[PDB]
Amino acid sequence: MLPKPGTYYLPWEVSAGQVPDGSTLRTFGRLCLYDMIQSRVTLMAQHGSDQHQVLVCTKLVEPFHAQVGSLYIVLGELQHQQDRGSVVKARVLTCVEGMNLPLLEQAIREQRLYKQERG
Amino acid sequence: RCEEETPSLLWGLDPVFLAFAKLYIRDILDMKESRQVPGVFLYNGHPIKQVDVLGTVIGVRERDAFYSYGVDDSTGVINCICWKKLNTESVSAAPSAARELSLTSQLKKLQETIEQKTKIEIGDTIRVRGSIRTYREEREIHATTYYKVDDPVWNIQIARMLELPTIYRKVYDQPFHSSALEKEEALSNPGALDLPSLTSLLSEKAKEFLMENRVQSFYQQELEMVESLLSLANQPVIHSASSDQVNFKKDTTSKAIHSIFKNAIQLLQEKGLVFQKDDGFDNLYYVTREDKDLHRKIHRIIQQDCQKPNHMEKGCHFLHILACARLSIRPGLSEAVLQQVLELLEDQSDIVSTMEHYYTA
């Protein structure tokens, strides 16, 4: 059946635990670590503070062509673990280069404001 | 909602009805389908048929005649019927001469790159131009054209994402209808009280119905048997006018109905819509609008520069146009039909009025 959308979210919502666990979503981020053994990945982003994680699982996808600190785009769903907290089960992902992260952030912020503008 | 319930048939006074619109995918489902006619949908009054949407593909069902690609764009998701196309009449690859080799090679470049734009895999960015359809109660898009978006980075996606609210607020959010609403409002609708007026309304409805049915030729009796046209014609006005033959109300009124049908088709001849070819018949008529044949001929006689003059003429003059047509085809070609076709041609972009009375193509 037709899946729920890749609605846009950013690391702040997972770090703030705002975006509920067990829900679909889409985000970009900066590659930090990759585990070839267990097929697990960490992307990082900081709220002008300590870098905040995003736990991801390499399912049906290939994590290539961009490096650590370089940029990637993912969509899927997150689920909780007591020790690990929660991890995104990927559904689509790819590397991307030459991006304008503040611009994307402005885009999503405007988009959400416009959502607020809907009666 | 009156304002939402825009004039019947949702006329193209509002331009968007003719051009691919750009709405959020999520909104594409929230719109209604028109209860007046299927195959058309509504948003804030503005009627929509052709839609434009760009996102990423997330699922596939492959069929013999079409593919079915599930597509997402952030706000929502849908599935899209992407009719396929085969390469019938295959172009071979041969060591042709310089010109032929170059033509074939460039054609092959174009073809292979078209394939690369056409072929697709999940997660990719996809653009589709097409219209809204519904099936199994589910709403979908049947694409007129679709191609892979070759962007290496989200910049163009970003542009679209930033844009859509802009175009919404500028154009689509505008509900108002600025038409003057110059409606007749059924004045003397059930009875014209005047056989000429009845004939005028009859010709109106009859040309409407003929253009609807696209009938190119017709015997007048064929038209005289139409249910709606009959109903319009047999209103009490004609029964009262033909009532002088009290002993033959039925017969006199039916004869008057046939006569007023004749009068309507004659009014059409006068206005150049229909005409009686040199068919030797007494009530056979050919409709100009459907007369693609005469369109083609009169387009030949100037599209190919006017053949009679040696001098480098830019086109031809109304009178010489008419005269060369009557010379090459038939003197009986009325000026009314000639005017009608000259109008329709420039409507079609098959002729242009550089001035009045002289035209080119």
Curated annotation (Swiss-Prot), chain A:
As annotated, the DNA-binding region falls at 1-119
**In the record, what terms sit under GO molecular function?**
single-stranded DNA binding; telomerase inhibitor activity; telomeric DNA binding
Tagged with keyword Transferase = no
DNA-binding keyword on record? yes
What effect on the protein does mutating residue 114 to A have, as reported in its record? 2.5-fold reduction in binding affinity for STN1
Q: Which GO terms describe its biological process?
A: negative regulation of telomere maintenance via telomerase; telomere capping
The UniProt keywords, alphabetically, are:
Chromosome, DNA-binding, Nucleus, Telomere
Q: What is its main location?
A: nucleus
Q: Name one GO cellular component term.
A: nucleoplasm
Which top-level group of life is the source organism from? Eukaryota
Q: Cross-referenced Gene3D superfamilies, in alphabetical order?
A: Nucleic acid-binding proteins (2.40.50.140)
Q: InterPro entries, alphabetically?
A: NA-bd_OB-fold, Ten1_animal_plant
Q: State how changing residue 118 to Q affects the protein, per the record.
A: 2-fold reduction in binding affinity for STN1
Q: Indicate the quaternary assembly.
A: Component of the CST complex, composed of TEN1/C17orf106, CTC1/C17orf68 and STN1; in the complex interacts directly with STN1.
What job does this protein perform?
Component of the CST complex proposed to act as a specialized replication factor promoting DNA replication under conditions of replication stress or natural replication barriers such as the telomere duplex. The CST complex binds single-stranded DNA with high affinity in a sequence-independent manner, while isolated subunits bind DNA with low affinity by themselves. Initially the CST complex has been proposed to protect telomeres from DNA degradation. However, the CST complex has been shown to be involved in several aspects of telomere replication.
Identify its protein family.
Belongs to the TEN1 family.
| Protein name, per record | CST complex subunit TEN1
From Swiss-Prot, chain B:
List GO molecular-function terms, semicolon-separated. Answer: single-stranded DNA binding; single-stranded telomeric DNA binding; telomeric DNA binding
UniProt entry keywords in alphabetical sequence: Chromosome, Disease variant, DNA-binding, Nucleus, Telomere
Q: What is the effect of changing residue 72 to A?
A: Defective of TEN1 binding
Tell me the outcome of changing residue 158 to A.
Defective of TEN1 binding
Q: Name one Pfam family in it.
A: STN1_2
- TM helices/strands, residue ranges: none
Q: Which residues bind DNA?
A: 51-149
One GO BP on record is: telomere capping
GO CC terms in record = chromosome, telomeric region; CST complex; fibrillar center; intermediate filament cytoskeleton; intracellular membrane-bounded organelle; nucleoplasm; nucleus
Segments carrying the region annotation (Winged helix-turn-helix (wHTH) 1) are 185-289
Record family assignment:
Belongs to the STN1 family.
Q: What else is known?
A: Cells expressing STN1 mutants defective for dimerization with TEN1 display elongated telomeres and telomere defects associated with telomere uncapping.
Q: What is this protein called?
A: CST complex subunit STN1
Question: What is the protein's species of origin?
Answer: Homo sapiens (Human)
